[PDB]
C-alpha cells in the first residue's frame, strides 16, 4: 500500500507555494489594505493569520502527510461519519475548475494581444470604442482599456445577460484550449511532472514581482501610491467589518482545508517535518501578497499623480484591476510591450499552478478512492480536461463573463467555508486533538504545542463561523455593472453552492443507515478511525 513521493522536498514546497499564491494575492489584498485603513489592516490581518489561518493550514498539511491518502479517503478513514467532507471538497474543486481557468484564458488572450508595437488598449479610436470612451478612468465615462476588455476581449455588451450567451468567441476558446493543454500535459503523469512544472509556474511570479516592482517604484508618483497603500488609520480597525475582511482574506488566501494540501502532503515522506513547511509556505503566502501590494500601488500612485486619474477610480479589485486599470497604466510607460508581456505571463503563471492544485486534489482523491482510475490516470485526466473545455466553451461566449461571475460568486465561496468548518470539527472534537497530537508527534517527533491545540480546538471553528456569518450578513443578490441577474440565476447559484455541502449530511445519513446495530453503536462504529 506504499505510494510515490515528491522526488524532491523543494517540489513539495514550490507546489504548495504555487497553489497558495493566487491572483487573489495581487488583486484583493492590496485593495483590502487600501480600503481598510492601510498599514493598520496588518493588525487584523496578522492576528487572523496567526489565529485560525495558519492553524488550519498546518492542520490540513499534517492530515495529508499522516493519512497518506487524498481527501475522499483521508476523511473516510479519519472519521467515517464525516466521509462526505471528501466528496464535498472534490465537488467544490470540480466546480472551481469550470470558472477559474477562464481567468488564465483571459491572461493568455492579453498576452497574445501584447505582441504588437502599440498596445491596442492605448486609445479610443478603435472600431470597438464608443463615444463615451475616454483615455483613462473617469466618472460617467468608460476608460479605453475598459472599452477594450469589455467590448473586444469579452464582447460582453453584445450579450443581453446570462440568458443570452451569444456566439462562441473562438479566439478565446483557443486560449482556453491552450490552458487545458498545459494543465493536461503537466498533470497527466502526476507529481513526477507537476513537481517540475511548478519550478516555472511558482517561481516566475517572483521574477515578475521583482522586476515589475522595480519598474513600479521608479515611476514618478510611486511614493504617493505607497502612502495610499500603507498610511495607517487605526480608527478603522475598531470596526468589525475590517476583522471580517481580514478573516475571509486569510482563509481564502491560504486555502486551508481545501483538500489540495491533503493531496500534496500525502506524497511526503511520513517523517517529513510538515510543521516547518506549513510555517514557511504560509509566511511566503502573506509575504507575496504584501509585495504584490507594493507592485500594484506603486503604479496606481504613478497613475494618480501623472495621468490625473482620481485614485478612487483606479483602486479596485478583481479583473477590473488587472485587465483594465493596470494594463491601462502599462500602456503609457516606456517599453509598454515588455511590461505587458511579463505582466500577463505573471498572471498566467499565478493562475496555472493554483489550477494544478484543484486538479491534483481531484485526481488524487479519485485515484485513491477508485483504483480503476488510479491505474488509468492519463485517460482519466484527458476525459476530465475535455469535460472542462467543453463546458468552458460557455464561458468563452460573448456573454461568458456573466457565467464566469455567477460561478465565481456561488461555485465555492459559501460551500468551502462549511466544508472546512466540519473539517475542523471532525478533526478537533470527533477525532480528537489528543490523537491528532500523537499523530503529529509520531510524524515529526514533537507534539504541537498547546497554542496549536487551542487554535484547532476552539478558535478555528469560531474563526470559520465568523467568516461565514459575515459572508451571509453581507449577501446581496448578484449584480454586475447595472446588469442585475434574474432570480432564476441566483437560484441556480445557490443550487450549485448547496450541491457540495449537501454531500456532508447526505453521506453521513447514508453511512448511518448502512452500519448495523442501535443508534449509539452506529455512532461509535462510525467514529472509530480506520486505523484503530
Amino acid at each position, epitope marked *: 500500500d506504499e505510494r510515490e513521493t515528491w522526488s524532491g522536498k523543494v517540489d513539495f514546497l514550490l507546489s504548495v507555494i504555487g497553489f497558495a499564491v493566487d491572483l487573489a494575492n495581487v488583486w484583493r489584498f492590496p485593495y483590502l489594505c487600501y480600503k481598510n485603513g492601510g498599514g493598520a489592516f496588518l493588525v487584523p490581518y496578522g492576528i487572523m493569520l496567526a489565529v485560525g489561518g495558519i492553524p488550519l493550514f498546518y492542520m490540513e498539511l499534517a492530515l495529508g502527510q499522516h493519512n497518506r491518502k487524498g481527501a475522499i479517503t483521508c476523511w473516510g478513514r479519519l472519521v467515517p461519519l464525516f466521509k462526505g467532507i471528501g466528496y464535498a471538497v472534490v465537488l467544490i474543486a470540480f466546480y472551481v475548475d469550470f470558472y477559474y481557468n477562464v481567468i488564465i484564458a483571459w491572461s493568455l488572450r492579453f498576452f497574445f494581444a501584447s505582441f504588437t508595437n502599440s498596445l491596442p488598449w492605448t486609445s479610443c479610436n478603435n472600431i470597438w470604442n464608443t463615444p463615451n470612451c475616454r483615455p483613462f478612468e473617469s466618472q460617467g465615462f468608460q476608460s479605453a482599456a475598459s472599452e477594450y476588455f469589455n467590448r473586444y476581449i469579452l464582447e460582453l455588451n453584445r450579450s443581453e445577460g446570462i440568458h443570452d450567451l451569444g456566439a462562441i468567441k473562438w479566439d478565446m476558446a483557443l486560449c482556453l484550449l491552450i490552458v487545458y493543454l498545459i494543465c493536461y500535459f503537466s498533470l497527466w503523469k502526476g507529481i513526477s511532472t507537476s513537481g517540475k512544472v511548478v519550478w516555472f509556474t511558482a517561481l516566475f511570479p517572483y521574477a515578475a514581482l521583482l522586476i515589475l516592482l522595480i519598474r513600479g517604484l521608479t515611476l514618478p508618483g510611486s511614493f504617493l501610491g505607497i502612502q495610499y497603500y500603507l498610511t495607517p488609520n487605526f480608527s478603522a480597525i475598531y470596526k468589525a467589518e475590517v476583522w471580517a475582511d481580514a478573516a475571509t482574506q486569510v482563509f481564502f488566501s491560504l486555502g486551508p482545508g481545501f483538500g489540495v494540501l491533503l493531496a500534496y502532503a500525502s506524497y511526503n515522506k511520513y517523517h517529513n517535518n510538515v510543521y516547518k513547511d506549513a510555517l514557511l509556505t504560509s509566511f511566503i503566502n502573506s509575504a507575496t501578497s504584501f509585495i504584490a501590494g507594493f507592485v500594484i500601488f506603486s503604479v496606481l500612485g504613478y497613475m494618480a499623480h501623472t495621468l490625473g486619474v482620481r485614485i478612487e477610480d483606479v483602486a479596485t479589485e478583481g479583473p477590473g484591476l488587472v485587465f483594465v486599470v493596470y494594463p491601462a497604466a502599462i500602456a503609457t510607460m516606456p517599453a509598454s510591450t515588455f511590461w505587458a508581456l511579463i505582466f500577463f505571463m505573471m498572471l498566467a503563471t499565478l493562475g496555472l499552478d493554483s489550477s494544478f492544485g484543484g486538479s491534483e486534489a481531484i485526481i488524487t482523491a479519485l485515484s485513491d478512492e477508485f483504483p480503476k482510475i488510479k491505474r488509468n490516470r492519463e485517460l482519466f485526466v484527458a476525459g476530465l480536461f475535455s469535460l472542462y473545455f467543453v463546458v468552458g466553451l460557455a464561458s468563452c461566449t460573448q456573454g461568458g463573463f456573466y457565467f464566469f461571475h455567477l460561478l465565481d460568486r456561488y461555485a465555492a465561496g459559501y460551500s468551502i467555508l462549511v466544508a472546512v468548518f466540519f473539517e475542523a470539527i471532525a478533526v478537533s472534537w470527533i477525532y480528537g486533538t*489528543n490523537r491528532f497530537s500523537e499523530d503529529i508527534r509520531d510524524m515529526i517527533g514533537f*507534539p504541537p504545542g498547546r497554542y496549536w491545540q487551542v487554535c484547532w480546538r476552539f478558535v478555528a471553528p469560531i474563526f470559520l463561523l465568523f467568516i461565514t456569518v459575515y459572508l451571509l450578513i453581507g449577501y446581496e443578490p448578484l449584480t454586475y455593472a447595472d446588469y442585475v441577474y434574474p432570480s432564476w440565476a441566483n437560484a441556480l447559484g445557490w443550487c450549485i453552492a448547496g450541491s457540495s455541502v449537501v454531500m456532508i449530511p447526505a453521506v453521513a445519513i447514508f453511512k448511518l443507515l448502512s452500519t448495523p446495530g442501535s443508534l449509539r453503536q452506529r455512532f461509535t462504529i462510525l467514529t472509530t478511525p480506520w486505523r484503530d
Partner: antibody
Amino acid sequence: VQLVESGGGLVKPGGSLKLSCAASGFTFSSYAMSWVRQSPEKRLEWVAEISSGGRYIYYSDTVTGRFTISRDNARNILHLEMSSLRSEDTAMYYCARGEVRQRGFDYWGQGTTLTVSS
Amino acid sequence: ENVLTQSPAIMSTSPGEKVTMTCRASSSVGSSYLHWYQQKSGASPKLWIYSTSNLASGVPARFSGSGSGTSYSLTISSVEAEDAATYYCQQFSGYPLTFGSGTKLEMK
C-alpha cells in the same frame, strides 16, 4: 517528577515476568514513555517505546514479539510484559520519559534488576 | 540498526585537562536527534546534551557538544573530579533507538 519501577528479581529461562513503572509529578497521559535496559557490562539498549496514548508502539529487533509494552493513563502506570525470557534479558531496566525526540530521555527511573537463571 | 560506536572506550584525565569524546554513526544522524547522557556509577543516566550542542537543564557550562552528520563530539573545557562518569551518545532519528557503547572518564 520521578519515576519508580517495580518487578524484577529471578525468573527461570523461558519464563515470563511483568515490569511496572509508576509515574508522578507530571501529566503522564501526554508523554511517550520508553523502556531502556542496561546489561551488566553497562551497555545501554533501548527495549520498547509507547506513544502518549499508546497507539504507536515500537520495539528493538532483539525483543520484538517476545515483550509487550503497555500503558495505563488512568493510574499513571507503565508496564512491560515479558515472555520467553532468555539469558540475554538479564539486565537492569530503566523507565525513560522520552517525550520529544529532539530532547531525548530527559527523565529516568531508578531501574530494577532482572536476572534470568536457574 | 544504526549502531553508534563511541571512542575512546575508556579515558582518564587530570582535573583541568581538556578532552573530547566522539560518537560515530554507521548511518547519518540528523543534527537535531543526537543526544548525550551521563551515568555515574550506581545511579540512573541523566540527559546531558539534547542535540549537537544544547546543554540540558542543570548541566554545567563547562560541557559543550559539537559536530554533525556521522561524527559527533562531546567536549569538556575543564574536567572536574565531580563528574568522572560514563557518557553515552544516542540517536533518536530512526528506530530502533541506539545508544553508543559508552565511554568513561577516570580521574588520575
